[PDB]
RNA sequence: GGAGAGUUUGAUCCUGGCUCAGGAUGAACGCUGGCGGCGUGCCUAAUACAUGCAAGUCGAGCGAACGGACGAGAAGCUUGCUUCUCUGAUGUUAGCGGCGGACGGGUGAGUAACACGUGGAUAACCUACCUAUAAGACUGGGAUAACUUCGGGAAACCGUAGCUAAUACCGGAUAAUAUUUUGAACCGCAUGGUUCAAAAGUGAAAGACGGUCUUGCUGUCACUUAUAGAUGGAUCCGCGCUGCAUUAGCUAGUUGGUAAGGUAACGGCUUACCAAGGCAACGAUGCAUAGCCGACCUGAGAGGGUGAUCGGCCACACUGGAACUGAGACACGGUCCAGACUCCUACGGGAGGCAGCAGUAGGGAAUCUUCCGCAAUGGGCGAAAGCCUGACGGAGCAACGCCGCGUGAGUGAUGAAGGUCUUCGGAUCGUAAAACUCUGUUAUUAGGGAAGAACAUAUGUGUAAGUAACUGUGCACAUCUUGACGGUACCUAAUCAGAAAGCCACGGCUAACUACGUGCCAGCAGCCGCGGUAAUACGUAGGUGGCAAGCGUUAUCCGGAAUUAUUGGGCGUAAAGCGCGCGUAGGCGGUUUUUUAAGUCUGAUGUGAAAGCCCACGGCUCAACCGUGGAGGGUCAUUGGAAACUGGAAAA
């Protein structure tokens, strides 16, 4: 992170636009898949690009309106 | 989004006439799954259904509806009554409840227009709170267009806490009403419980 | 260094000045000693004012350079007629 | 930066020189006075009354102001 | 004024935790987007900063230069040029000197304590300006900047030799409660205080502008001394004010005394001596964290959390230290020193300090214009006009929030087309559309309004205090004259339904269902849990509910939580009674009588700033908002009453 610590994150959604070395924003939220994660990134505000395979919860997963 | 809806389908859901507009298909309920059996009713659905059943009446929205509700939270005597009369002592109501329309919305586009004159004064907002010791009039310029005197002529009704002068188009508010003076009567207890949780 | 003076209190466009005694060192819109009277340059022309005119003379008798915008209205109420009618009395 | 106080600088320096001359002239007068207490002629009254004039010739301007002057007179007009 | 719902098991009741629903943010992020009113906007790096302004003013105190209106003598004759002489109005600003720069604006690194709040005290204090009063306002002198002239200096700036003034500076005279010393009375909270009598002690601008004009007289302002008043400041005190005891001894100028000195004043504030006390389980100390308060959020209420904007107090100004001027500073745009940093240099040496307004980089998830104006209010100087005012008025950017209007309304069935589904008849979107008939809030145009916010000071009239004399002065009426915002808001007429709607969710908790794809894969998840070919929980469609120019998620706080339980809990077995005893400190205490009045109750006086909250009212078209006025609030001080109870004293 900015503060120079080390944590884990599950990315949500279909497709992931990311790789090694890539900047990305972070929220919090825990999932019960396991510990070793209690966060998850957000889709669309920075390098993690919005996936437009959705139309229903477009307000999330980085999507913008189709027409 | 004060009003851009069909507003009939709502009254098809609830089981009331208005609004709107007009009066077969009402025995049903909306939607594909509409006509059939559906869920039961929780207590929540009852107080809620009551709420919307008063909300789409005046076409208004919730953040205004609450603020009304808790300015009734100040004054003495019972509560729900005061919410009703203060909700129907409004400008749309004193228009249509005087008989200058066929529905409640006709009054709203009548007053955004500015056609009426609260105490002989232009006002463009239906959210005014009408009071006694007043008149109400029609911008004498415009007391003869197609809509109005088409509507004025028939005596739809009159409550005794309103006076009226069909020759003058002059109403004037008279007494503090109650539901027993205001048709389209309700239950109050259920809706006041809704603003507990 | 003590000057009865004005402390505007209204919001954006409809100001409602207050007459008040104070030492000039202070900010205007801050601290005071005692309110007296008031002012309202609109909602009626001529303005709507009150005045103590009982103890308002107290502060003059023991020291003040009352400003002109005030001095005008104190004349409009005329309490200064009593003020000089004691000061230039003797 | 500097705008106008440069006036008050020069003034501050003038009044520096003046004021210290007044004070230190007094202080030496007091030294004479207290040292005259040991003595036996007078040789005291001239000096002590003189210095007790000087306290006031120099107190009206500087920061002393009176109370401390009056303490100096209080102790010094008594020791002789 | 207060709500419960799920979840351990094959099924049950309990104890018990976790999660959800609500409200709120100085808020960011995703989606989306019409407008106005109001209010807000570096919470992080007290990190560094280019460029602009942010504090000057008085010629009616002073010397000195510029200036040239007007008047005029000769003229080279080009008969208005001009040489000088010049008469000198109006004005200017370099300088001296007086008052302000310490207020005002900005931030919260430090600070765990009289820093802050609240209530008190000062027989331990100070106080320019402004008021009121009383008295004075005499007599002398010597210099010096600007200005001339020299030199060193790259520059910064420095010195040399003359010369000039003042409300400048320096002596003398005179001057009372002001200091010492003496005595009488009076007074009290202790040191002490108030008044009277007598010996020594200090000042001032002969000033400026004006009228009468005798230049006398006297006026306005100004100066000095003194006594008050008020204002501002200071110190001391009782009380309340954070977490750890896996922080239990600390302290030697410490604690007390004597003397001296010091300070506005008291004081170990500081020196020299005598002394060994002082503080602490009622939590000393040390440790990490932090500006506080009024207030804000929440909660039915007791209570819990925070200290944004607004206002009060405090500390700080690159870090650190010291002191001058001064009424006040140990000084936010002042100095001097040392230091780090940046910069100029002829290398000798010099310059600077945005946590002022804007703005830039930097960090950060994230926080704007290098704006117009001094009309108003308040400041500072002045005799006033007037000048300066990035305070402030007020425009601009941000859906950041609150409030408000609308994106049309009435009639319109055919259940049209068209979508989806169909148990393939039909149902559904659906008066919804289409169409008919009105409107134009709002917007497009054009006019008016350029509304208020403006009261003013100076300028003429008359009127009272005082003067020998409104001649002149010090005061209430009257007219003249002043808008950055803004050609605004608002108003008036015309034009078109044409520009102006989305987000989330649909197993239950929770209002809100059907088809496809998918097949323990992609995926969701706040909980319980879905998903292995027919998923109401995944992704797609349609429809529905909620919600609205706003909506969802994330982080934080309170609620629900009776899950620190004083209101309001429990210990046989569910977590939980030490293994038991002796006894200190502390907490609790049998009965009757008498008294006391600390506790208690009651009444009053003061205070508890204002704004805010809540109630009533009035205005902005209503609301938000603003104001008014009310009630309200203390473990608060002072004081008069009651005695049953707790308490103290006494008797039984």
UniProtKB/Swiss-Prot annotation, chain A:
Q: Can you name this protein?
A: Small ribosomal subunit protein uS12
Q: Which residues of the full protein are shown?
A: 70 to 136 of 137
Region Disordered: start-end pairs: 49-67
Q: Which cysteines are joined by disulfide bonds?
A: none
Function as written in the Swiss-Prot or TrEMBL entry: With S4 and S5 plays an important role in translational accuracy. Interacts with and stabilizes bases of the 16S rRNA that are involved in tRNA selection in the A site and with the mRNA backbone. Located at the interface of the 30S and 50S subunits, it traverses the body of the 30S subunit contacting proteins on the other side and probably holding the rRNA structure together. The combined cluster of proteins S8, S12 and S17 appears to hold together the shoulder and platform of the 30S subunit.
Q: Which residues form a coiled coil?
A: none
Which family is annotated? Belongs to the universal ribosomal protein uS12 family.
Q: How does it assemble?
A: Part of the 30S ribosomal subunit. Contacts proteins S8 and S17. May interact with IF1 in the 30S initiation complex.
Tell me where in this chain the PTM 3-methylthioaspartic acid is found.
Answer: 33
UniProtKB/Swiss-Prot annotation, chain B:
- GO MF annotations in UniProt: rRNA binding; structural constituent of ribosome
CDD domains from the UniProt entry? S4
Q: Which GO cellular component term is one of those annotated?
A: small ribosomal subunit
The record's annotation in InterPro entries points to:
Ribosomal_uS4, Ribosomal_uS4_bac-type, Ribosomal_uS4_CS, Ribosomal_uS4_N, S4_RNA-bd, S4_RNA-bd_sf
Q: What is this protein called?
A: Small ribosomal subunit protein uS4
- Tell me the protein family, please: Belongs to the universal ribosomal protein uS4 family.
Question: Which HAMAP family does the entry mention?
Answer: Ribosomal_uS4_B
Q: Name one Pfam family in it.
A: S4
Query: Where on the tree of life does the source sit, at the highest rank?
Result: Bacteria
Q: GO biological process: any one?
A: translation
- Please tell me whether the keyword RNA-binding is annotated for this protein: yes
Swiss-Prot record, chain C:
Write down the Gene3D superfamilies for this protein, in alphabetical order: 3.30.1320.10
For this UniProt entry, what's an example GO CC term?
cytoplasm
InterPro entries attached to this UniProt entry: Ribosomal_bS16 (IPR000307), Ribosomal_bS16_dom_sf (IPR023803)
> Which keywords appear in this protein's UniProt record, sorted alphabetically?
Ribonucleoprotein, Ribosomal protein
Q: Cite the GO molecular-function annotations of the record.
A: structural constituent of ribosome
Which GO biological process categories is it annotated with? translation
Give the protein family. Belongs to the bacterial ribosomal protein bS16 family.
Could you identify this protein by its name? Small ribosomal subunit protein bS16
**Per UniProt, what is the name of the gene that codes for the protein in this document?**
rpsP
Curated annotation (Swiss-Prot), chain D:
The processes (GO biological process) annotated in the record are: translation
The molecular function terms in GO held by this entry are:
small ribosomal subunit rRNA binding; structural constituent of ribosome
Q: Which UniProt keywords apply?
A: Ribonucleoprotein, Ribosomal protein, RNA-binding, rRNA-binding
Entry GO terms, CC: cytosol; small ribosomal subunit
What residue intervals traverse the membrane? none
The text of the family note is: Belongs to the bacterial ribosomal protein bS20 family.
| Annotated function | Binds directly to 16S ribosomal RNA.
User: Which HAMAP family does the annotation name?
Assistant: Ribosomal_bS20
The protein, known as: Small ribosomal subunit protein bS20
User: What is the organism of origin for this protein?
Assistant: Staphylococcus aureus (strain NCTC 8325 / PS 47)
